[PDB]
């Protein structure tokens, strides 16, 4: 997936920010959240999150749903490298497994249960 954040900031600038924020806040992880292409879902006002490592994916879902102003029956799915993470996993575990070389974790969100469909 193309993330706008990656297209707008060269890798060396993102990597230096990721290293700095990880050294400054060792118990938090930096997360970029963007809408999947051709998803049919409301926009997200902010894309750059500094998240406690012990926050769960499910707790992050709840917060992101509220930021988008979704109704209960409006679906929301997270994808990390096209895979939906478990809601009981911590954001720190997801970050350790899947953060990119700029030290950011990248999450795509969609209304759909499969990426790219």
């Amino acid at each position: 997936m193309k993330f706008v954040y990656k297209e707008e900031h060269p890798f060396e600038k993102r990597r230096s920010e990721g290293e700095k924020i990880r050294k400054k806040y060792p118990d938090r992880v930096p997360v970029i959240v963007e809408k999947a292409p051709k998803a049919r879902i409301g926009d997200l006002d902010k894309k750059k999150y500094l998240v406690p490592s012990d926050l769960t994916v499910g707790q992050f879902y709840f917060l992101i749903r509220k930021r988008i102003h979704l109704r209960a029956e409006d679906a929301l799915f997270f994808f990390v490298n096209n895979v939906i993470p478990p809601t009981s996993a911590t954001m720190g575990q997801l970050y350790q497994e899947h953060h990119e070389e700029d030290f950011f974790l990248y999450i795509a969100y969609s209304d759909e249960s499969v990426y790219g469909l």
Binding site: I21, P30, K46, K48, Y49, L50, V51, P52, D54, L55, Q59, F60, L63
Partner: peptide, 8 residues
């Protein structure tokens, strides 16, 4: 530019 998230 960070949105700070906290444990509930």
């Amino acid at each position: 530019g960070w949105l700070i998230i906290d444990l509930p």
